[PDB]
Write a protein that binds this ligand. Structure first.
Ligand SMILES: CCCCCCCCCCCCCCCCCC(=O)OC[C@H](COP(=O)([O-])OCC(O)COP(=O)([O-])OC[C@@H](COC(=O)CCCCCCCCCCCCCCCCC)OC(=O)CCCCCCCCCCCCCCCCC)OC(=O)CCCCCCCCCCCCCCCCC
Ligand SMILES: CCCCCCCCCCCCCCCCCC(=O)OC[C@H](COP(=O)([O-])OCC(O)COP(=O)([O-])OC[C@@H](COC(=O)CCCCCCCCCCCCCCCCC)OC(=O)CCCCCCCCCCCCCCCCC)OC(=O)CCCCCCCCCCCCCCCCC
Ligand SMILES: CCCCCCCCCCCCCCCCCC(=O)OC[C@H](COP(=O)([O-])OCC[N+](C)(C)C)OC(=O)CCCCCCCCCCCCCCCCC
Ligand SMILES: CCCCCCCCCCCCCCCCCC(=O)OC[C@H](COP(=O)([O-])OCC[N+](C)(C)C)OC(=O)CCCCCCCCCCCCCCCCC
Ligand SMILES: CCCCCCCCCCCCCCCCCC(=O)OC[C@H](COP(=O)([O-])OCC[N+](C)(C)C)OC(=O)CCCCCCCCCCCCCCCCC
Ligand SMILES: CCCCCCCCCCCCCCCCCC(=O)OC[C@H](COP(=O)(O)OCCN)OC(=O)CCCCCCCCCCCCCCCCC
Ligand SMILES: CCCCCCCCCCCCCCCCCC(=O)OC[C@H](COP(=O)(O)OCCN)OC(=O)CCCCCCCCCCCCCCCCC
Ligand SMILES: CCCCCCCCCCCCCCCCCC(=O)OC[C@H](COP(=O)(O)OCCN)OC(=O)CCCCCCCCCCCCCCCCC
Ligand SMILES: CCCCCCCCCCCCO[C@@H]1O[C@H](CO)[C@@H](O[C@H]2O[C@H](CO)[C@@H](O)[C@H](O)[C@H]2O)[C@H](O)[C@H]1O
Ligand SMILES: CCCCCCCCCCCCO[C@@H]1O[C@H](CO)[C@@H](O[C@H]2O[C@H](CO)[C@@H](O)[C@H](O)[C@H]2O)[C@H](O)[C@H]1O
Ligand SMILES: CCCCCCCCCCCCO[C@@H]1O[C@H](CO)[C@@H](O[C@H]2O[C@H](CO)[C@@H](O)[C@H](O)[C@H]2O)[C@H](O)[C@H]1O
Ligand code: SF4
Lengths: 69, 115, 83, 172, 72, 49, 318, 157, 98
């Protein structure tokens, strides 16, 4: 019966969700719990480099608020 | 760095599969096995002789049409211009002349393959 | 113009793709000329500030230039906010 | 990474040497594909983006037509490769040796002139507008639609006239 | 007696209605959609496959198979 | 609603072969888990349904 | 961590490819009133692994007339490029974030034809040369309109960035305003993947096996792995461009689940199409693209230049 | 025996299972016997559910099913395509003609059994054998492949 | 920049040397012309990027447009040569010595 096609489909379906989900989680793990920063233009890269320089630990994603001034 | 890293891994994975495929199996080389296939009979000539191209005119038309799209692919940046009327006329004229070129070749039977 | 109408009708039945292509091409030219929103597309591209707006030295003869960004002088963007 | 662009321009040089030796156009076509890819990387390396991807895309299309034309009109029973003829192979090896020699000697005489092996990587990017937004090469190319429309008029005319030209050349 | 398999050439005039129906058929691939409908309808049909060798194809007493020599 | 009828027949097929081991035996030996009437068994152990 | 992320892309995609070979054979079977694989594993779920192990344990061909460097390179290039097409795909966040990701796809996909061209030429047999020259014709047919179709769509996106397509479709599928281009795009991806009814470079009823006819064993498997990986890729691309999966900044996995469902469905229609139609003649594919798609594609490109200007709907640069 | 011999034996099973489970016959049929081969692929028997898939290229085939009469004019061509199958390869002789010449055994133009031209693994009798009889022979080839001991024999050399 | 532009000029010189030193196939020479075009494209593109000359980036694209027209005509001519003689060899193209 047609529903016997589904075991292969479910395996396909699981395999096609892992890349999207794994990339989203690995980004947050490696970017301080936030989305990985996107630098489309030079201005955005400049902000990341400034964030890295003021972080104290050479990581752009470690943010400094008003407690730092 | 990341794009270089993943593409090298892609190259690395493909080459490893090739090495496995060539060194794992048992081999048995002899002349009749390695002769070129042609449905059980021997070829009467080389496969390296000229093979006529009946769509040769479409093929070199494709060369010109491929530079036409190269002129069109800046359009996403061009629509940001203040000079909207100029951009629009240039894009309209460009598409129209390409259409007229296709229309002429079509009516000259340039898209028909040679016999 | 009954001869063309039979022509166009046959072309519609037999070569619909080409009829649609020519109609779409003609509509694309016509629409910017008759649309009331065509003027705004250039104005929106003009209001996008990709560059720093360099201030001007005040010489005492600039009644039209704002002294602060929240002065009521200078170009307003209310038209776009309510577009 | 300080040798990255020199390595690429060095690979590009070898590709043109291979093309210049003119093996069968099958391998000539392959040589241009690799050189086109290496050329795309160099444009990228200097901060390009659109121009590098364009030239590779255009040459990918161009060599596919040349492949088709080669199998019909430029083929022999035994197509030549770079290794097939000892004479072509020797000038391939000698050409590569003369490249190493030419770069080595020029480095010695000037040290900072055409070749500056001590300073590789220090003089790739000169100035960069650090906080800019509208800077990518596609913006520059797009000026054909607004500020450099004459460039697009002549380009468009040549493609349009090219259709009429190739139809005339090819009719019997 | 004979019949024509492909003589439907009573050429007629075309209205806007029929010309548009012809236009929709060409541009929206309608007969190609009917083909997909047919194969879709088979997807949900029970397959005719039997589970050989646990199941067997039907045979009849007349079946001609392997020879034998008989006794009284 | 009719789906529930179908799923119940699936439960009968899945639990009607003598526990888990009996279901695995037939499923992996015959690739089929239908339940039928036992018509008989021959002297060699073949079972007919 | 970036190396772990490469694994969690490549390995699941290669398993998805392997099981698409199973799904194809079962979907085709049931549409043909058969079952398809149901013995090798439960419901046939080990059949792909058996075929893979069989092929790599088989003697690989070393034909005498063959030019061996290109013969080996072509299947290697095929799988490399198929895997590389996945790295910029945003699901919703890509492994590699590219500014011109769409142009990367076209260039990478366009280099993929050379694996067919070189393998067919390098094999140095007549049926393989026939298959290579059909690939030349195939690319000339569809590549003329595929980039213009994409161009018109991306005048509503405003960039070549794949991630921007997610935001463009925040409130509506791009299918709705672009369904005529979506239709032409869908036919183009069938031809681009050499799938039926345009399976001409292999076309087994005519050329026995076309470009790969001299290929055996593991080298043959690479072409097959590359073809099934590309089918998933092109449909996933169609999903992101026209069928914008639902995106919420705080629920990224919702995008991934919705993306997979639509991508699975679009891959199923590829197998459904194969079961339904006869093959085109390869001169007829050229006429389909150059005398039907190309006129409409050019008109619609002009219309989609015209639209944002006269509706004041130019998308943002950033 | 030893743990090295046990491991070798389990590997034989694994590689044997893979070749059992993915037998790809050549698209190759000579006469009426090929019609019954079509009926084995047809829905009732659906050979593809056992993992059996026709491929037209000898380079991509594992089994040759000699399905019909083998004439003298055809014999060199059949030998050619057999030689062009990569190994491991198997031959199934199907029907009386292929088995031994059958109804045409005494003809001037007919090869009296394809096993004068190629080695044969399974002989399927009948004229034609039914689709089911052919399927039985295919399953007998699988069990033969299940008995292969190539790695065990290599280990003991 | 200094060493890259030296290598690119050498790449052009080699492609020109390829053009000037014929072998047999006319098509092999047509490929050498495309090599010179490719070298000049990169040289122009890299120069525009290194000087941040965005108003000059149309020019490299126009180089490729006319090169495509040149290559299309070259191939069109090569069809004519092949039709006459059955090859693309340049030694056949010698009727105009007298
Ligand atoms: C992949 C690794 C190679 C594996 C090839 C192989 O299977 O073994 C054959 C070979 C074993 O000997 P063989 O099988 O008797 O050689 C017969 C081959 O048919 C004879 O081989 P062939 O007919 O394929 O011709 C070989 C030829 C063709 O090979 C190629 O050139 C293609 C790859 C070039 C990249 O290669 C060469 O001429 C030397 C290439 C030197 C590098 C090119 C530098 C100049 C071009 C610059 C642009 C770069 C492109 O090794
Ligand atoms: C340093 C160079 C680095 C490498 C750079 C290479 C540049 C691209 C190469 C493009 C060459 C090309 O395509 O020409 C094809 C041209 C036509 O080839 P073909 O139509 O196929 O048949 C004639 C060949 O001789 C093939 O037929 P064949 O086998 O009957 O040739 C017989 C003879 C040919 O005699 C030669 O070996 C010619 C080369 C003489 C040595 C030149 C040293 C480099 C200066 O071979 C020999 O027995 C002498 C071997 C010992 C020579 C040492 O072949 C040649 O004449 C030699 C090509 C290689 C020479 C490259 C050197 C370029 C430097 C400019 C030389 C002209 C300067 C004149 C004003 C001063
Ligand atoms: C290049 C090595 C690629 C390794 C890919 C994985 C395959 C591993 C199994 C095959 C090992 C082949 C080998 O190197 O044998 C030693 C080689 C012999 O290679 P071979 O000819 O026996 O390879 C065939 C392997 N079997 C027997 C399993 C089919 O002997 C040497 O020492 C030459 C060096
Ligand atoms: C890499 C992918 C491999 C994954 C597949 C492995 C399992 C394959 C066997 C299978 O599933 O079918 C069971 C098969 C199924 O039975 P069957 O295939 O013989 O019979 C099928 C016919 N009907 C339907 C009627 C039953 O079990 C067997 O009896 C054959 C034994 C095969 C054992 C395979 C190797 C065992 C594992 C060894 C690993 C290496 C050892 C290292 C020390
Ligand atoms: C996506 C898939 C890619 C990967 C594919 C990988 C598939 C393979 C899976 C693993 C199985 C590999 C088995 C080898 C493959 C078969 C090749 C073949 O048939 O060659 C036969 C050959 C034939 O040998 P022969 O000597 O009898 O043949 C002589 C010549 N002729 C052929 C004329 C008779 O046998 C071998 O060479 C076997 C070598 C491999 C031995 C197995 C590993 C050694 C294990 C020792 C035990 C260690 C115990 C330690 C703990 C205690
Ligand atoms: C306001 C402004 C409005 C402007 C927009 C108007 C747009 C109108 C809509 C037009 C949409 C048309 C899309 C283009 C496809 C097409 O129509 O071409 C038809 C083409 C050729 O048809 P043919 O019968 O061969 O006749 C040739 C002359 N027409 O035939 C084909 O293309 C069919 C090819 C299909 C091949 C089978 C592939 C699978 C198909 C199933 C897909 C399921 C999903
Ligand atoms: C891409 C889709 C293109 C647009 C789809 C709309 C086409 C359509 O409406 O299908 C019509 C078809 C009826 O066929 P027909 O008799 O020729 O219609 C007469 C029209 N004057 O309708 C039918 O055939 C009935 C539906 C059977 C097919 C069901 C599966 C739908 C397939 C579409 C999904 C494609 C994947
Ligand atoms: C075997 C052959 C395999 C070839 C695979 C072909 C792949 C298609 C062609 C790839 C060329 C286009 C690459 C590209 O455009 O990436 C540019 C990328 C920077 O991306 P960008 O969006 O500009 O962002 C930077 C500002 N934020 O730039 C980077 O991030 C790094 C520099 C880009 C160069 C990478 C080139 C691909 C790797 C080639 C490996 C060698 C292959 C031999
Ligand atoms: C032989 C080839 C023929 C094919 C080429 C035909 C090209 C001719 C194009 C005609 C259409 C031009 O359409 C023209 O669009 C521009 C904007 O783009 C409109 O311009 C309008 O909006 C713009 C903003 O964009 C305002 O700044 C302007 O003041 C206002 O007029 C014009 O009102 C309309 O007339
Ligand atoms: C086809 C491939 C061709 C490969 C070509 C050769 C690639 C390798 C390039 C070698 C050229 C010089 O490469 C490298 O240049 C850098 C500048 O970046 C030098 O830089 C380093 O050493 C030199 C002094 O020795 C000083 O500049 C300094 O101490 C340090 O920066 C390296 O010492 C030199 O080894
Ligand atoms: C005989 C065949 C030739 C006839 C066919 C071609 C007709 C001409 C069509 C192209 C018209 C180009 O028209 C030309 O456009 C440019 C911008 O591109 C305008 O240029 C203007 O704006 C630019 C913007 O940067 C300023 O820098 C410049 O100083 C100013 O003149 C010219 O003032 C106008 O003359
Ligand atoms: S054995 Fe019988 S059925 Fe088979 S080919 Fe011969 S005559 Fe025909």
């Amino acid at each position: 019966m047609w529903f016997e096609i589904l075991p292969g489909l479910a395996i396909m379906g699981v395999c096609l969700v892992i890349p999207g989900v794994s990339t989203a989680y690995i980004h947050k793990f490696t970017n301080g719990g936030k989305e990985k920063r996107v630098a489309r233009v030079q201005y955005q890269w400049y902000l990341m480099e400034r964030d890295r320089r003021i972080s104290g630990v050479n990581r752009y994603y470690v943010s400094k608020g008003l407690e730092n001034i | 760095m990341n794009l270089y890293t993943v593409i090298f891994i892609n190259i690395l994975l493909s080459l490893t599969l090739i090495l496995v495929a060539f060194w794992l199996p048992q081999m048995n080389l002899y002349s009749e096995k390695a002769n070129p296939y042609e449905c059980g009979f021997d070829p009467t000539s080389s496969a390296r002789l000229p093979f006529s191209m009946k769509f040769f005119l479409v093929a070199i038309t494709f060369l010109l049409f491929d530079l036409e799209i190269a002129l069109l692919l800046p359009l996403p940046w061009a629509i940001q211009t203040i000079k909207t009327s100029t951009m629009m006329i240039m894009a309209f004229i460009l598409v129209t002349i390409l259409s007229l070129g296709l229309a002429y070749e079509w009516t000259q039977k340039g898209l028909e393959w040679t016999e | 113009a009954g001869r063309i109408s039979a022509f166009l009708k046959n072309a519609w039945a037999k070569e619909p793709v080409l009829v649609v292509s020519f109609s779409v091409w003609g509509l694309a030219i016509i629409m910017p000329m008759i649309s009331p929103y065509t003027k705004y597309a250039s104005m929106i591209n003009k209001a996008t500030p990709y560059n720093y707006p360099v201030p001007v030295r005040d010489d005492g003869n600039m009644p039209d230039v704002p002294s602060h960004p929240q002065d009521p002088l200078g170009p307003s963007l209310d038209w776009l906010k309510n577009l | 990474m300080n040798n990255y662009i020199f390595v690429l321009s060095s690979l590009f040089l070898v590709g043109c040497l291979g093309l210049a030796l003119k093996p069968s156009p099958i391998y000539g076509g392959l040589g241009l594909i690799v050189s086109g890819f290496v050329g795309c990387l160099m444009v990228l390396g200097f901060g390009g983006s659109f121009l590098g991807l364009m030239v590779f895309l255009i040459y990918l299309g161009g060599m596919l037509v040349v492949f088709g034309y080669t199998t019909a009109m430029a083929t022999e029973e035994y197509p030549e490769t770079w290794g097939s003829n000892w004479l072509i192979l020797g000038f391939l090896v000698l050409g590569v040796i003369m490249e190493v020699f030419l770069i080595c000697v020029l480095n010695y005489y000037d040290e900072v002139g055409v070749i500056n092996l001590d300073g590789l990587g220090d003089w790739l990017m000169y100035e960069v507008d650090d906080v800019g937004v509208m800077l990518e090469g596609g913006i520059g190319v797009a000026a054909m639609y607004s500020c450099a429309t004459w460039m697009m008029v002549v380009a468009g005319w040549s493609l349009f006239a090219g259709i009429f030209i190739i139809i005339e050349i090819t009719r019997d | 007696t004979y019949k024509y398999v492909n003589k439907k050439e009573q050429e007629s005039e075309v209205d806007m209605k029929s010309a548009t129906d012809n236009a929709a058929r060409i541009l929206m691939w309608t007969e190609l959609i009917r083909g997909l409908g047919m194969t879709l309808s088979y997807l949900f049909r029970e397959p005719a496959t039997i589970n050989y060798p646990f199941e067997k194809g039907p045979l009849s007493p007349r079946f001609r198979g392997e020879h034998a020599l008989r006794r009284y | 609603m009719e789906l529930v009828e179908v799923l119940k027949r699936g439960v009968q097929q899945v639990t009607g072969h003598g526990g888990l081991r009996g279901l695995l035996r037939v499923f992996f030996r015959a690739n089929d888990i239908r339940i039928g009437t036992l018509v008989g068994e021959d002297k060699y152990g073949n079972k007919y349904y | 961590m970036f190396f772990i992320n490469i694994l969690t892309l490549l390995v699941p995609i290669l398993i998805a490819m392997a099981f698409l070979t199973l799904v194809e054979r079962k979907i085709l079977g049931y549409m043909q009133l058969r079952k398809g694989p149901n013995i090798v594993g439960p419901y046939g779920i080990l059949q792909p692994f058996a075929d893979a192990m069989k092929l790599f344990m088989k003697e690989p061909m070393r034909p005498l007339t063959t030019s061996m460097s290109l013969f080996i390179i072509a299947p290697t290039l095929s799988l490399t490029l198929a895997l590389s097409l996945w790295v910029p795909l945003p699901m919703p966040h890509p492994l590699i974030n590219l500014n011109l990701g769409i142009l990367f796809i076209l260039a990478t996909s366009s280099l993929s034809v050379y694996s067919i061209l070189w393998s067919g030429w390098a094999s140095n047999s007549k049926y393989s040369l026939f298959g290579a020259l059909r690939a030349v014709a195939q690319t000339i047919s569809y590549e003329v309109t595929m980039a213009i179709i994409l161009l018109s769509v991306l005048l509503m996106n405003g960039s070549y960035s794949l991630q921007t397509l997610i935001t463009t479709q925040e409130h509506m599928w791009l299918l709705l305003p672009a369904w005529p281009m979506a239709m032409m795009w869908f036919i183009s991806t069938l031809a681009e993947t050499n799938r039926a009814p345009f399976d001409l470079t292999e076309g087994e009823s005519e050329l026995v096996s076309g470009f790969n006819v001299e290929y055996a064993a593991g080298p043959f498997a690479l072409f097959f792995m590359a073809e099934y990986t590309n089918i998933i890729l092109m449909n996933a691309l169609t999903t992101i461009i026209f069928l914008g999966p639902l995106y919420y900044i705080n629920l990224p996995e919702l995008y991934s689940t919705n993306f997979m469902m639509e991508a699975l469905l679009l891959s199923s229609t590829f197998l459904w199409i194969r079961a339904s139609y006869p093959r085109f003649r390869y001169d007829q594919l050229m006429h389909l693209l150059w005398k039907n798609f190309l006129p409409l594609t050019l008109a619609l490109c002009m219309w989609h230049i015209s639209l944002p200007i006269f509706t004041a709907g130019v998308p943002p640069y950033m | 025996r030893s743990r090295a011999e046990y491991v070798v034996t389990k590997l034989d099973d694994l590689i044997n299972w893979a070749r059992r489970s993915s037998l790809w016959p050549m698209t190759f049929g000579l006469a009426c016997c090929a019609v019954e081969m079509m009926h084995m692929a047809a829905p009732r028997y659906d050979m593809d559910r056992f993992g059996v898939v026709f491929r037209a290229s000898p380079r991509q085939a594992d089994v040759m099913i000699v399905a019909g009469t083998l004439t003298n004019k055809m014999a060199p061509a059949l030998r050619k395509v057999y030689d062009q199958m990569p190994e491991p390869r198997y031959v199934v002789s199907m029907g009386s003609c292929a088995n031994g010449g059958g109804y045409y055994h005494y003809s001037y133009s007919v090869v009296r059994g394809c096993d004068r031209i190629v080695p044969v693994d399974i002989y399927v009798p009948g004229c034609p054998p039914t689709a089911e009889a052919l399927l039985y022979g295919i399953l007998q080839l699988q069990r033969k492949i299940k008995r292969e001991q190539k790695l065990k024999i290599w280990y003991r050399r | 920049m200094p060493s890259t532009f030296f290598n690119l000029t050498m790449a052009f010189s080699l492609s020109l040397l390829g053009t000037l030193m014929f072998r047999s196939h006319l098509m092999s020479t047509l490929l050498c012309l495309e090599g010179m075009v490719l070298s000049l494209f990169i040289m122009t593109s890299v120069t525009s990027l290194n000087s941040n000359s965005m108003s000059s980036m149309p020019i490299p694209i126009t180089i490729l447009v006319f090169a495509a027209c040149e290559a299309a005509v070259g191939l069109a001519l090569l069809v004519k040569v092949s039709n006459t003689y059955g090859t693309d060899y340049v030694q056949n193209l010698n009727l105009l010595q007298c």
